[PDB]
Design a protein around this ligand. Structure first.
Ligand SMILES: Nc1ncnc2c1ncn2[C@@H]1O[C@H](COP(=O)(O)OP(=O)(O)O)[C@@H](O)[C@H]1O
Lengths: 97, 442, 96, 109, 85, 96, 80, 109, 96
DNA sequence: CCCTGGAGAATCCCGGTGCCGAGGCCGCTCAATTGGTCGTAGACAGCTCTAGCACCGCTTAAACGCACGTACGCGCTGTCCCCCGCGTTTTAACCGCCAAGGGGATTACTCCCTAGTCTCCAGGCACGTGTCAGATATATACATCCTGTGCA
DNA sequence: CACAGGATGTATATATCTGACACGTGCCTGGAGACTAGGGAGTAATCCCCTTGGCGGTTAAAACGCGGGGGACAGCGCGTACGTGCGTTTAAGCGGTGCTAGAGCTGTCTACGACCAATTGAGCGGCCTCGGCACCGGGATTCTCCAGGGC
């Protein structure tokens, strides 16, 4: 009885919404904690400027977006609609990573 | 006005209350802004209610008024408003976006009220709405929130258009003279617009005498035996010494050396690796690895076979966790009132510790939790495991058990570690406390 | 008075007013434009330096800049930039 | 006497700092000697590239009902143009976003 | 001895966040095993970039990592970033 | 008579050509192709033999790598036959 | 001058594919491979001719070819 | 008088030309000044990389029952090593061939 | 009258006789090794020059060479190369 | 039934040719050796503002958890045609050799261009400061899905 | 199978507000003007080498055709895991204390290491020459694939 959308309308709606914007999709404090955790292994007693973490987040988001676009291309090549770790691995292998 | 007017309901004002009302009325007649430092528990809210009732009744132009209170006191102030002086109408702004919009567009914007009660967060959110209405009187309760200039609340509260202003705070002086200058700048910006015996002390007294009124809680009750204090110097455990030397000389990140020395003089187990291995037992390791813990292990059972009802104040949740482990090991009843304790869990804990026939013994409290409440009269001994820079925080912590409802002697035991940063902290705190005394107690 | 930092912001603003008279630009966009100019300058200068070293010469000249522009820019942009640079060099040589 | 000072940018009819470009070339360790016309050529090329990208970004802002240019407009201008996209293929623009692009198999049908 | 661990930081990159990134990438349906692979590849990318940035910072004899060090590391990787330097 | 199944000769050729290191394109046709392509950029261009050999080496290496990626795409599509769709997908992911 | 791209013959393309490691080849792939080869050669020869013209020579050298390949990101070892 | 000449390569115990590396650094337009230790360090690094590659290539050649090293041996050595492959991941070796591998799905059932 | 060309051929041959005493090398392999040495030299030198520019210094030092090696070479290669270079520098400072 | 026979390809061992790598010489140019200078970088003070540590109160958007149904991924079948293996015929590559000339590579010379200096001064940069464009909120109006209900 | 209508999301105006962009101002430091000195490169001339054009014979390689099996592609069915919406929980974000030092930035002073110059002797590049490794052919083996007891 209650209103409900078909399985895939909200997905395309979100696709359009997030392709219309420019904001950051990851959470700033968790990303900062991850960056500090990674840098601790390389060197201890390291301090980060606020701009460094922002640049890291921008670069990481751009890399992930491009990876997902290539992954979607692979999934469509495989006559599918869902993306898979197979697609991610194929994209990385062809790009040379 | 030597006697309280007839508009007050549900009781008549006291002598100190009516003299404070007269002081406030003289302040307004002179057109000055002032600070009521009558200390917590001496009817500041009742005096302000009486002043507002006077302005509404005896003077025929009661305009828009605003009262700023902590969110923990909004209900109490609204209750006092409704009980004492029902002839005046008051409204409160609290809730999410939809509640706020409904309230403003139904009651506030039409403009039929006379007193608006809001908290700090709602003032910051609704500064646009509260900025429109011309303000006749601005009451700020617990005024030591706006001590720091260039803070957002201070800027916003100085941006309003207020004809008359008033501050209510028990502790006008906290650390320096800059906060007192900020409060006096909010009161009268023209008079105090600079960097605030004969050359000192007395000059400050003469300056602050017209603009201040403080009554120590001694001329009203003539009861509640005075504070008793004992200071205990304690040496550290051997691993505490080893870690102290390690931190002093310079793998673990030890950035704030003073921040490490603090807890290192409390308990080394807070550091990573100072604990024993996989078994993680809780048997006598805690006691022997902290001298303060040794002294507390001596003190607590003796108070228990004596008056018991002890309060332990500490400045770290990790220290509170270690103390909880120790109390579980010793099979003591413990209550942890901390910053993370949900509000409903605090009230029943306080009531149960204050139950007429209780069994609770240890009550662990973070020194800055709650605030301006918590009446633990049944408690006897107050143990300050640490001590912070402000002596005011320690004073309020020690008087949380030293309240009007207390009938027996209360003693405050203060632990300190020799040849460490605790000496510096306590001596600074004493310097600030003596500044407070020599500038205020007169 | 902090240290002086040099940027192409004023020249970018002049070109912007030349192209679109009534338009503006933000701090982030200006920073991006400064970075773009720096990166392009670096690429062109490096390619000209490598050309001079390959041909065993010690001077970077307008010929080297033109060849680097052709090597780095993609086609229509390359030809338009070559025309603009040649025109500017002709104007400079004719003037002084 | 001493003649009036005219900028080399004024001589070449440019809106870019020919003198600063010459100084950067000489301080950048690109070669031991720098020609006279090389900074003029380089300044003209930089000016032309800036003009192209700014024209495209201003067009984007005008069709976006906005007077000021933002990194989103810069990204929209850099993409949708083949030559600029080829030039800046490996460049990430902060707060630029992505072009709207939905594959035809994902469209409802 | 009374301590606890909240969560590993690689789990702070949440499932809805990865979904939003995929939505911007242009993806309709996502398998449930995608999130672990995404976390792994993000960790690899961050480790490489941070190693280069820390190398630059150590060379400059500084204890603070700066945006210029990050952009130099990215340019070394071949991922030039405009907007911070 | 004797006839091999369709695919054993292919595997034999795969093994032998992966073991060998010679060039797989005819040199005179490659040289003619190079000269014809160079006719659009300049006239009367003369070529060293080493230049043509280097061009052939680079072209063969590029095509071999492209075919590896194309085979991977075809296997991802659960096939064994490589297709122009596979080549285009490989080029698109490489960034060409 | 024509028919020389068609001189890049089907057996040669098959040999290249076999060295790549493919088993079955569709019939439409030969034209695609020829087009890809033309694009690659066009780019490389364009850069090499630019280097030659800057050198003010008429002969294209292995050094010019190597420099072009290196500047396109395809460094070649074995010719200088 | 003057002492007999002693090469800096002899002083540092290297088989690569410290003086030639110093001259190449001076003439290569890298910096205005060059220190004394930089040529020695760079010669040591180049010698180490050459020795590693040559050792791998010689092992590969002896696996071929040959005495001389060829480009095929160099390619085998480079592509069979992870770190050398990463270092030379965008390089083409002339007359090198490719690593022999067949995808498992193409093998007969 | 062929002008003198330089190469690392004799030094590569010395290293080869040090590591494999009775193994020879051909001319094509020698050319490949010479090209490899030149490429590595150029990479490290360019990285060190960029480091000097970033830090606003005028001289290239062993510190810059070490940082460039850490940047370019991956992992164990970088560790072993740093060890070898440090040893060579210490020997040069002690011997001189 | 699988396991065996036949046939083709691949492998290993031997003997004769060719040429290319390794060694030995000449000379000339580049690197080592001394000596002298200066400017770059190290070392050191003084200042200042950001960054880190352990908490507290409060708000609210976002994340987590959960149940349901539905497209969708995956497997299995069948068809047919397209691709592969093999024989035959033809075409052009490959090799060897020869002939001619364009052009790359070298050298000598001169001049003209650029580096370096000193004086001068104006364009560019930091600092204040104020007004407008863009963000936000909120009520409308429009376009978009989705399902039911006659059509069966 | 084709519309009606309901519900929802999204575009559209309009009003308010704020903080960043654009502009003016003073100062200073780096670019321009005028000048001189020296060496890099443009220009001409010469040599020889190495590219191009052609011819003839060889044989391997390509093109064409043919026949048949296996792989691609469409179709169907199933049962499963992911989208969707709702209710509950958590921590991200903001605003505060509270000290200290800490780390980076600028100005000054001073020594030592790198440039530069002249001089000279071995190290290294080019040129010959020669023999052993690779190559090429030949002939005797072992492996593997295909057809059949449906051998
Ligand atoms: N009308 C009154 N007369 C005397 N004492 C009072 C009165 N009202 C409150 N108090 C005392 O004040 C204490 C609480 O102080 P506070 O909350 O400041 O009061 P208020 O809210 O009235 O200002 C109580 O313990 C109570 O004893």
């Amino acid at each position: 009885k209650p209103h409900r959308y078909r399985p895939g309308t909200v997905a395309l709606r979100e696709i359009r919404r997030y392709q219309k914007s420019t904001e950051l999709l990851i959470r700033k404090l968790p990303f900062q904690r991850l960056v500090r955790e990674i840098a601790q292994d390389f060197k201890t007693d390291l301090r980060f400027q606020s701009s460094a973490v922002m640049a890291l987040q921008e670069a990481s988001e751009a890399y992930l977006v491009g990876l997902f676009e290539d992954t979607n291309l692979c999934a469509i090549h495989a006559k599918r609609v869902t993306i898979m770790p197979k697609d991610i691995q194929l994209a990385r292998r062809i790009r040379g990573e | 006005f030597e006697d309280s007017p007839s508009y007050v309901k549900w009781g008549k004002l006291r002598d100190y209350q009516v003299r404070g009302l007269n002081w406030l009325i003289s302040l307004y007649e002179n057109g000055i802004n002032g600070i009521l430092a009558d200390e917590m528990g001496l009817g500041k809210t009742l005096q302000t209610i009486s002043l507002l009732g006077y302005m509404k009744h005896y003077r025929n132009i009661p305009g828009p008024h605003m009262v700023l209170v902590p969110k923990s006191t909004l209900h109490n102030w609204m209750s006092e408003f409704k009980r004492w002086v029902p002839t005046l109408r008051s409204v409160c702004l609290i809730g999410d976006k939809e509640q706020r919009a409904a309230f403003v567009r139904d009651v506030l914007l039409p403009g039929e009220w006379d007193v608006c009660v809001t908290s700090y967060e709602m003032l910051i959110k609704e500064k646009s709405v509260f900025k429109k209405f011309n303000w006749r009187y601005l009451v700020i309760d617990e005024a030591h929130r706006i001590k720091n200039e260039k803070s957002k609340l201070s800027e916003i509260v100085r941006e309003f258009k207020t004809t008359n202003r008033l501050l209510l705070t028990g502790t006008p002086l906290q650390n320096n003279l800059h906060e007192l200058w900020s409060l006096l700048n909010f009161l009268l910006p023209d008079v105090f617009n600079s960097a605030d015996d004969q050359k000192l002390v007395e000059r400050l007294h003469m300056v602050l005498r017209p603009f201040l009124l403080r009554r120590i809680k001694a001329d009203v009750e003539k009861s509640l035996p005075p504070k008793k204090e004992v200071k205990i110097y304690v040496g550290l455990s051997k691993m505490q010494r080893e870690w102290y030397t390690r931190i002093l000389m310079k793998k673990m990140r030890l950035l704030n050396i003073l921040m490490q020395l603090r807890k290192c003089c409390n308990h080394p187990y807070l550091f990573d690796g100072a604990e024993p291995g996989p078994p993680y037992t809780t048997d006598m390791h805690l006691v022997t690895n902290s001298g303060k813990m040794v002294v507390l292990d001596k003190l607590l059972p003796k108070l228990k076979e004596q008056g018991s009802r002890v309060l332990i104040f500490s400045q770290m949740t990790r220290v509170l966790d270690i103390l909880e482990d120790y109390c579980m090991w010793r099979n003591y009843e413990y209550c942890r009132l901390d910053g993370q304790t949900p509000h409903d869990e605090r009230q029943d804990s306080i009531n149960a510790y204050n139950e007429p026939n209780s069994t609770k013994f240890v009550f662990m409290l973070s020194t800055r939790a709650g605030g301006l409440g918590i009446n633990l009269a049944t408690a006897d001994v107050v143990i300050l495991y640490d001590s912070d820079w402000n002596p005011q925080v320690d004073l309020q912590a020690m008087d949380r058990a030293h309240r009007i409802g207390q009938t027996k002697t209360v003693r405050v035991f203060r632990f300190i570690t020799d040849n460490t940063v605790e000496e510096r902290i306590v001596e600074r705190a004493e310097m600030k406390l003596r500044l407070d005394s020599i500038v205020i107690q007169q | 008075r902090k240290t002086r930092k040099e940027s192409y912001a004023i020249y970018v603003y002049k070109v912007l007013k030349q192209v679109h008279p009534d338009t503006g630009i933000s701090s982030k966009a200006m920073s991006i434009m400064n970075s773009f100019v720096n990166d392009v300058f670096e690429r062109i200068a490096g390619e000209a330096s490598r050309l001079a070293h390959y041909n065993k010469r010690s001077t970077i000249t307008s010929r080297e800049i033109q060849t680097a522009v052709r090597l780095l820019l993609p086609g229509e942009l390359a030809k338009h930039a070559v025309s603009e640079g040649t025109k500017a060099v002709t104007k400079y040589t004719s003037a002084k | 006497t001493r003649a009036k000072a005219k900028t080399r940018s004024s001589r070449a009819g440019l809106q870019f700092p020919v003198g600063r470009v010459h100084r950067l070339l000489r301080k950048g360790n690109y070669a031991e000697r720098v020609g006279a016309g090389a900074p003029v050529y380089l300044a003209a090329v930089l000016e032309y590239l800036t003009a192209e990208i700014l024209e495209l970004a201003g067009n984007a802002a005008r069709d976006n009902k906005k007077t000021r240019i933002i990194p989103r407009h810069l990204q929209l201008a850099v993409r949708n143009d083949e030559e600029l996209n080829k030039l800046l293929g490996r460049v990430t623009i902060a707060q630029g976003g992505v072009l709207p692009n939905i594959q035809s198999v994902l469209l409802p049908k | 001895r009374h301590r606890k661990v909240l969560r590993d930081n690689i789990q702070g990159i949440t499932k809805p966040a990865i979904r939003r990134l995929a939505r911007r990438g242009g993806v309709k349906r996502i398998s449930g095993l995608i999130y672990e692979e995404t976390r792994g590849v993000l960790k690899v990318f961050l480790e490489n970039v941070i190693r280069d940035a820390v190398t630059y910072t150590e060379h400059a004899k500084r204890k603070t990592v700066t945006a210029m060090d990050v952009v130099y590391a990215l340019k070394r990787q071949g991922r030039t970033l405009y907007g911070f330097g």
